[PDB]
Amino acid sequence: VEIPSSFDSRKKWPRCKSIATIRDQSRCGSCWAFGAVEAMSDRSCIQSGGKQNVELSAVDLLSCCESCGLGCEGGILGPAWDYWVKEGIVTGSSKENHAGCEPYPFPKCEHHTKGKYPPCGSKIYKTPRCKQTCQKKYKTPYTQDKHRGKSSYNVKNDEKAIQKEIMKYGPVEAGFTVYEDFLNYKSGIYKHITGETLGGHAIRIIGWGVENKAPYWLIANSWNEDWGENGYFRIVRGRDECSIESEVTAGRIN
Ligand SMILES: *[C@H](CS(=O)(=O)c1ccccn1)[C@H](CCc1ccccc1)NC(=O)[C@H](Cc1ccc(O)cc1)NC(=O)N1CCC(C(=O)OCC)CC1
Known part of the structure; x- marks a missing residue:
């Protein structure tokens, strides 16, 4: 297939509100899980023709997957998509919107940035x-509310493979290396310039573009809407910048 020079999942599938939905992991290293349930949410809507148009429970994946790591202290991406395949994940929203089987137990806050939430x-x-056990307010039983995927795979570390995957099947989960300068990101196309290795961050790639010939990925972060570019960022594409093309993870409902 032909790869457009720019692509936005939001514009291809605007009926799937989840794609334009920025979440908040709060005071928890639960990025790995957010990236998973975000892309699962998107892909469930994209791939089921809207039949499953849901907000999947971050806390449900976080707390129940035994094979997914150290929970709020860090997690493993491939295992999260495997759990979604094998057990499935229930619906559940933010703590503030208290919707679905299992809403997030933790409140929104500001991540190394200014805004309307407490720090x-x-x-x-x-x-x-x-x-x-779903909240009393919700009218489906837990086991019934399970939304499963059918497959779980790594995407190849190749720009062009990642592009075709997103464009055909929807947003993906990706891992990248956090250096100290990322925590000061306000806007623009990010690339590591200064700072020590802090750790690894798991996010959702929704598409790509160019800005005066500069290739970038478009990424939804899970640090609320006040962070960065109304909750998103861009980053250098095609150079394996901070290992952004190296642990791309997704799956399909068929
Ligand atoms: C999310 C990143 S964050 O920037 O939002 C953040 C950083 C620090 C605190 C809170 N949020 C999390 C943060 C986890 C963390 C928590 C406390 C202290 C330090 C870190 N990061 C993860 O979940 C990463 C995601 C990742 C995976 C793969 C990859 O290529 C890039 C990024 N994974 C981990 O942190 N792991 C640590 C524990 C490992 C494990 O389970 O060990 C075997 C049992 C799994 C990987």
Whole structure:
């Protein structure tokens, strides 16, 4: 197929509100899980013709997947998509919107930036308990509310493969290396210039473009809408910048 020089998942599939939805992991290293349930949410809408147009529970994946790592202290991407395939994940929204089977237990906060939420600070909450019981308000039982995928795969570390995957099947989950200068990102096309290795961050790639010939990925972060470019950022594409093309992870409902 032909690869357009620019692509936005939001514009291809605007009926799928989840694609334009920026989330907040709060005081928890639950990025890995957010990136998973965000892209799963998108892909469930894209691939089911809207039949499943849902907001999948971040906390449900966080607390119940035993094979997915250290929960709020960090997680493993491939295992999260495997769990979605094998057990499925229920619906569940933010703590503030309290919708779905299992809403997020943690409140929104500001991540190394200014805005309308209290600051996140540097503390980390304890990984929530696996509950398997929808809120009283919600009218589907837990086991019934499970949304499963059918496949779970790594995407090849190739710009052109990642592009075709997103454009055909929807947004993907990706891993990249956080250096200290990323935490000061306000706007523009990010690339590492200064700062020590801090860790690894798991986000959602929704498309790409160019800005005066500069190739970039378009990425939804999970640090609320006040962070960065109304919750998104862009980053250098095609150079494996901060390993952004190296652990692309997705799957399909068929
Ligand atoms: C999210 C990144 S963050 O920037 O939002 C953040 C950073 C620090 C605190 C809170 N949020 C999380 C942060 C986890 C963390 C928590 C406390 C202290 C330090 C870090 N990051 C992850 O979940 C990464 C995601 C990732 C995976 C793969 C990849 O190529 C890039 C990024 N994964 C981890 O942190 N892991 C640590 C524990 C590992 C594990 O389970 O060990 C085996 C049992 C899994 C990987």
